[PDB]
Amino acid sequence: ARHFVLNTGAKIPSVGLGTWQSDPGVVGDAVYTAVKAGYRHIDCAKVYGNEKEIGLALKKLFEEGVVKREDLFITSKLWNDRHAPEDVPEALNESLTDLQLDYLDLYLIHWPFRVKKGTNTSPENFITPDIPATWGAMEKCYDAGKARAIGVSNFSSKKLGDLLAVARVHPAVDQVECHPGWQQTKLHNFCQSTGVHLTAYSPLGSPGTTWMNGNVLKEPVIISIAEKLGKTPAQVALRWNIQMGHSVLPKSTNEERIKQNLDVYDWSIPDDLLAKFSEIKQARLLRGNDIVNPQSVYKTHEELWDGEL
Ligand SMILES: NC(=O)C1=CN([C@@H]2O[C@H](COP(=O)(O)OP(=O)(O)OC[C@H]3O[C@@H](n4cnc5c(N)ncnc54)[C@H](OP(=O)(O)O)[C@@H]3O)[C@@H](O)[C@H]2O)C=CC1
Structure with a gap:
């Protein structure tokens, strides 16, 4: 129950630290505490x-020998200003250098959204995405083994399908907001049907982020x-996502909550x-x-998210 299988053959641990x-x-x-407690997945x-x-x-x-590199699943993300194909491998190398890893x-x-390299989020810096060209650069990072899996985040089922149609390496993952408040049934079904893995971000509904409401x-x-069931509300939220076949990325810096967030395997929601x-x-x-x-290329929320309910 503690992992899901990506279309690359790799195992993704069902719980990752946000x-x-x-x-x-x-x-x-x-x-350090999370991995000592049994976490094998960090979302960065x-x-x-x-x-x-x-x-x-x-x-x-x-x-300290707590784990070897091969035991861990480390994720990072290409920021909106690094979409130019020449910029993609350099951004990956920056994260590899900071994380002090040879591969992710x-x-x-990170988003189906692009700004000019090295600029701030501000509308004059918006550039038309070229997701196929950006993906092409992501695929060379995959060929190189520097990213053992490549994927997308915040892609609707429509945008995920548009990319699958031109990808020589299918996205392994679509990391999206997913929790009891936002169940993503359409994308869930789409991901199941295309062999793309759905990782749930904000699986507790990000209660520490007031602007998210x-x-x-x-x-x-x-x-x-x-x-x-004698569980915490967090445990119930996390277990729900795991029973849907989704990995979850609960974020905590509290040892007790870090442990409780991994306690989602040896019991079920009837x-x-x-x-x-x-x-x-x-x-x-x-x-x-x-x-x-x-x-923006997205004049409305409907255009960004392609109408999903
Ligand atoms: N665009 C993307 O791809 C996005 C990716 N993500 C990823 O997903 C992760 C998770 O989403 P995030 O928005 O951080 O929020 P979460 O839904 O994981 O909620 C985190 C909040 O819940 C608290 N918390 C953690 N465990 C418990 C618990 N057992 N009981 C009660 N409260 C708890 C944390 O406080 P405390 O630390 O005190 O425990 C924190 O305030 C992110 O950290 C990130 O890695 C998130 C959003 C966007």
């Missing part, structure tokens, strides 16, 4: 501003099932309680408000 908003001063101990990004400190914690884990298990296009652990259905997830109102929490704009 590192968004894990500040440099705390991320190291979080990664250049734009999280902490990959050097993650690299220092991975180095410590390897040097997964390198993702998440309420997932306060959902009556979640609190009820938690009370019925089918009758799975039925109750129907009653949860659906709302996307990470809407991409800042890349939907008259200056």
Whole structure:
């Protein structure tokens, strides 16, 4: 139950440590504690501003013999300013250098969204995406073994299908917002049908991010099932995603929560309680408000997300 299989043949551990908003001063101990506790998957990004400190914690884990490199699944992501095909391998190499790794298990296009190299998120810096050219550069990173799997993030089933149609190396993963509040049934089915793995980001509904407006652990259905099964609301949210065949990326820098977030394997949500997830109102929490704009290729939220419910 503790891994899913990618179209590359690789195993992705079902639970990964999230590192968004894990500040440099705390991320190291979080990664170190998480892997000692049994985590074998770390989700990273250049734009999280902490990959050097993650690299220092991975180095410590390897040097203390907690794990070997081959035991871990490390993900990073190509930021929106590195979409130019010549820029892709250089961005991967920057993350490899900071993480002090020879390869990533997964390198993702972070968003189907592009800005001019080295610029800030601001509408004059928006450039028309060229996802096929960017993917082509991602495929050479895969050929080189520097990214043992390549994938995408924040791609609707429409944009994922458009890319699959021209890919000589299919995306292994589409990492999207997915939790009881945003169940992604269409993309779930699409990913199952195309052999693409769905990794759930913000699987608790990112309760530490106020601008995301998440309420997932306060959902009556979640609190009820938690009370019925003797689990925490977080455990119920995480287990739901795992039973859908999705990997989850719970973020914590708290040792007790890091441990509880891995305790999602030796118990199940009965089918009758799975039925109750129907009653949860659906709302996307990470809407991409800042890349939907008259200056954007996405003039509306519908254009960015292709209408998904
Ligand atoms: N565009 C993309 O591809 C995106 C990727 N991601 C990835 O997904 C990860 C997870 O999503 P994220 O938005 O961070 O949010 P999560 O849904 O993982 O929620 C994290 C928050 O929940 C708290 N928390 C963690 N465990 C528990 C628990 N057992 N009970 C109660 N509260 C808990 C954390 O606090 P504490 O630390 O105190 O435990 C933190 O405030 C990110 O960190 C990142 O790696 C996220 C968003 C976008």
